[PDB]
Design a protein around this ligand. Structure first.
Ligand code: FMN
Length: 116
């Protein structure tokens, strides 16, 4: 199965990506070398809804799962709608270890309804 996903380590400064799937490299047009150690916000740009970024920030703060749809940009500046699902990952002792982020490319929710 095709899986667009990244794993971040929230126990390192600014939640860096420590793993990016082949499909994530393909979608975003970045090499693994350009992604590893970055915060995933580098995919955002002018058209990204700051209200949606806020919802993600709060979900990471409270270590809660969330799904949002937001505008991201490939290396070559191509806009794509990203249906982004965030999942906290806890160790055996219930301590946060990682976040996993799974991307789906597509305008799943029409922009006119998303904007409401
Ligand atoms: C595992 C994981 C995957 C993420 N994937 C994306 C993504 O694909 N696109 C995106 O815009 N933001 C993504 N983010 C969110 C940003 O890295 C950042 O948390 C968000 O923009 C809110 O924080 P900020 O306001 O400090 O940027 C992801 C976050 C995590 C933890």
């Amino acid at each position: 199965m095709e899986k667009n996903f990244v794993i971040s380590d929230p126990r390192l400064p600014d939640n860096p990506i420590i793993f990016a799937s082949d499909s994530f490299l393909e979608l975003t047009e970045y090499s693994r070398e350009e992604i590893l150690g970055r915060n995933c916000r580098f995919l955002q740009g002018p058209e990204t809804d700051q209200a949606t970024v806020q919802k993600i920030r709060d979900a990471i703060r409270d270590q809660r799962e969330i799904t949002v749809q937001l505008i991201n940009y490939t290396k070559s500046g191509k806009k794509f709608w990203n249906l982004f699902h965030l999942q906290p990952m806890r160790d055996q002792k219930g301590e946060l270890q990682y976040f996993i982020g799974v991307q789906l490319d597509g305008e799943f929710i029409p922009n006119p309804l998303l904007g409401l």
